[model samples]
Target chain A: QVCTGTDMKLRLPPTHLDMLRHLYQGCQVVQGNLELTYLPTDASLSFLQDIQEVQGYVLIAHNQVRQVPLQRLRIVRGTQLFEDNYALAVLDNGDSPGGLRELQLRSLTEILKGGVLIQRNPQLCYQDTILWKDIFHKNNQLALTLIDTCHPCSPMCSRCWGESSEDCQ
Target chain B: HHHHGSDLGKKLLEAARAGQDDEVRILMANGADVNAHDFYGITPLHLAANFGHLEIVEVLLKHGADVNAFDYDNTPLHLAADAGHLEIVEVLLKYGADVNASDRDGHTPLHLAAREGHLEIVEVLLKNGADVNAQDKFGKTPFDLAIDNGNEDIAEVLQKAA
Candidate 1:
């Protein structure tokens, strides 16, 4: 809740929404990592309204969070790891509309050093193909890490499904 | 040639593995080879590290045992991580063991830790600059093995670190 400067690592359990809000609201740039795990059933990442850049990675996992709306996020020097959310269905706010979808990251233009890792979000496979395709296609050459049998929205889509395709295009 | 000192080496390996501090020191004082390997290619330092014998490890290292010595493919650091001994991990790291060193299977200490659901060890390895995305010989990252084996907690840690 009470972090001093950019060299902060915030790990939120089920509670501490107010602290999360306060941290996000006060810091324009988080110099270290931010981890949110095992959230309450109703929690979402909307509290990250003011965070514009992260010097480290942002990790969201096991919360069953349906969406994450990163409205002002522009760059992550480390990876943005979204895994095992189980209910995540959308992963974009990229120059798109505001209030319609569950997830948004419209301002994310580049991942400076790391990459975007999306895995084990089964329901996320049902989102718009164009949105999923566009984000990864743009970030293609930047250390894309994926796994087999996770979901078909990866470079390993063919291997993930236990079959062959001309391309995962 | 004094064939008299060879028995001390076998006794030293056994004492080290059993964590018998006095026996290990006595055998070593009797002129046991600090770098001697057993039939399985394991050394006294490997045994001590694998079994979490912190004091024994210090003694072996003091006697000039290679902290990074390998038994086949695994170093003392790999064995310590595999056994989930955080303090031993710290000790090995302090002695400059290669954090990213791999076995014949291409499994690093991080890979073994993640495969065994050693969450604390995984954190320590990652903090020490273990390669989270380094694939094994089977083309499996530590994260991939963690997910496949239903080690969700390990998977989560590796995922965040990816």
Candidate 2:
């Protein structure tokens, strides 16, 4: 049921916030993978507000954006993937407090046909903050594994997927 | 329309990268630089080729985009070959792309196409004057990479080329 030319991927680098706003500011259903990688200091992800469903993988990697403020993103429909391994891949970001310190896809609920791969993010904290089990709806292949040096790592039921515990349960 | 003309240039870069043929045409009509570069030296043609936008590549090329433009030592042909865009690869070559040009890593388009198991691209590169003995900074030839990556078809083609 896949159309070959219809797989539209939006790969954003450290630049192109203007292009981001111009093209995908209010997109509700992304038809393909959303690659937000190698982001820069000047990047403002306020444009990430309205997307509720991504029909493919969401790659957040090698970014210095510190915080990924995907506030209302909910479901990822995995018709596509990253490396045949992940529907959500956050990897190779900056050092602690320097690169990506938070993954704020606050309302992320379900991921179909895939798992989340969060690796090589040395600074990203709150690894145990949420009950990741309920998010992927209990896939054994959920790769919340390896190489992240989260300081003061929190325990389960901690509500924050970001660096802050101010909104913790 | 009141923004800088190169604002359209900026849009052109994004449009080419994202494969928006119509928008790229608009930007080109409005005098967008086909040779415009980002902070990283990535040109519109580089993006169009890398992202596999054949029409956009032709548009940029028709507008005099530098066929051999490089970003941090990677030419558009390098990207197109690595990403397995067969049509784009052919077009880049047709546009006077230096077939044997190497990247910072010293790997040429043949090296990438071979390593990635793009057998057709490998053959195309070979026929188009790609160096069969081309090696990376690691001193690995295209054949070596093909063998290492277990691309038997590519290895056979590379063996024939070598």
Candidate 3:
């Protein structure tokens, strides 16, 4: 969230980049909902400080809710996406033995425009069984549905959930 | 830490709104106060009430909200009445919300219902004993506000109900 001012062009710090890579892989955030109160470039003249973390990076012009540069942030794919707060990362699950799944845990920068990728179902509890537990090898959408959960909306998604109160860093 | 602090309240509110019972419970358990106000002083119930989230409201009420919780300028009834949420208004009144509570402008829920042409809300307010002739600082009665604002339908409804 914005503390007081605004900025432009946030440069990501190495530590934050490392965390971003891990989150892009698999971290399984356990929180709920988030509100984008401000963006980095819109709230300050520069977003350099915001790149240090994916916490509260306020943009200079990020005033209204609908106008945030959600698509622009997606361009960075993994590190950029992880450092930014646009509800891109999500917890997905498909039917694999260990129970409810959690993906985008590490590889948050997975190419979105590529062929539709299916992950294990993450919504199921431990008691529930994945239908194709011992059979299907390839990831498919249908199998995931039977034992999976859809990527929640931005607020509920693991990425922004209580992470960015002001904006994504 | 800064980021975590700011979104904590908003996330809790959304969890409440989405009816994520477990998440709500966890949030409260983690020291997230149930009655925390948003930037607008609107508690979770205020949102649930205005949005007609009856289930969410039920849960929040069960969690011990001040059934009659008022924001700085208005009460939840003003919001529900303005939204024409008659059922919610009924529920709130049943929960003991002072039917005659006024906002900063002295505009009661009755005035809101009348001005917004909420016929059902108007009826509900009147049935619950809202003063038909209640006036605000502007010397405008609920009826006068409706009539002067071209809400003839609400004015008519109030006239007949009274």
Candidate 4:
């Protein structure tokens, strides 16, 4: 259940639609930092849906993915970190069509250390809705929080675009 | 370890997993057991199928690899179908893979193909007599998966198949 140190520190480059298929196909636990970035366009991220824990920081940044579906990810120990900070970070994503719109880590419950940073995701929604305070487990654990106003309007629609109006259907 | 056959089998597994068709052929000719399996019951066929090594798959099958082999619970068909390898799926089927084989979680090859939205593979499996009504451990059928995964085209195909 321990992920290799080399595997964790490695970054992804544009390759194919199935680049994520080889390594994390059935992995349940990552022993190192899970940094998913520069993903090939329209690549399926379902390969990581099985992961339940990350022993290192969880950094998802600069990709054109529509979903960061860590629905089964339940715990993050934060043993390995970025700059000795950021237990979880979702940064600058969704520049292309159908870029990341929602970050539904539906099962995440615990964080042992570091802080979470979710910033400058152009099309990302539900960031305002998910309260990080409860997941952080400490008041000072919140690290350098920076968020811009999501498209605002409508009572029921939860999706958004780059404007202050109803963007969900 | 001078156990020639088993040693060659391990070599064959590595070759197949790396897409080394020539190495696989050489190992096969050198007397690697066609059905050789590792500690977890994974075979060279599983690797070839899962990794989309079409040539290695053909070689392994010609050498009498178990087409219906399972690594733990997933058959080569399960891997090929899930990985969206149409050619590998066709080859495995030609070798008489269990079209309706289910893993421990009750997931059939159809379940995997449908969930991943591999419409062509889904069609192939259905034509090869994959159980359209087959359900996994969660009691979800292939059609249900198409609907749940929001694949309208696959949902339509599965609807007509049902």
Q: Tens digits of per-residue lDDT for model 2 on A26-135?
A: 77778777777667755788766777888888887778787776777788877777655357778777742567777766678787755565666766776545555466
True contacts kept of each: 0.00, 0.00, 0.00, 0.00
CA deviation > 4 Å runs, candidate 4:
A1-169
Task: Kindly give the number of clashing pairs for every candidate.
Answer: 4, 0, 41, 0
Which digits, one per residue and each the tens of the lDDT, describe model 1 over residues B48-136? 88878999998888888998787655789988888789999988887888899989899999888988889998998899999998889
* Residue A23, candidate 1: C-alpha displacement in angstroms: 80
TM-score of chain A of each: 0.54, 0.75, 0.17, 0.76
Candidate 3 lDDT over residue span A4-88, tens digit each: 2212233322243233333322212212211132222222212221221222221221122112223222111112222232222
> Scoring only chain A, what TM-score does candidate 4 earn?
0.76
Q: On TM-score, who's better, 2 or 4?
A: 2
Model 1 alpha-carbon miss at residue B12, Å = 0.7
TM-score of 4: 0.50
Local accuracy of candidate 4 as per-residue lDDT tens digits, A56-90 = 88888777777776778888888876545567777
TM-score of chain A of 1: 0.54
Error of 1 at A65 (Å): 75
Q: Rank the candidates by lDDT, best first.
A: 4, 2, 1, 3
Considering summed lDDT, which 10 consecutive residues are worst modelled in model 4 chain A? A160-169
- Candidate 4 residue pairs that clash: none
lDDT of 4 by residue, B38-142 (tens): 544668898889889999999989988988877655899998998899999999999999999998789999999999999999999999998888989999999
lDDT of 4: 0.74
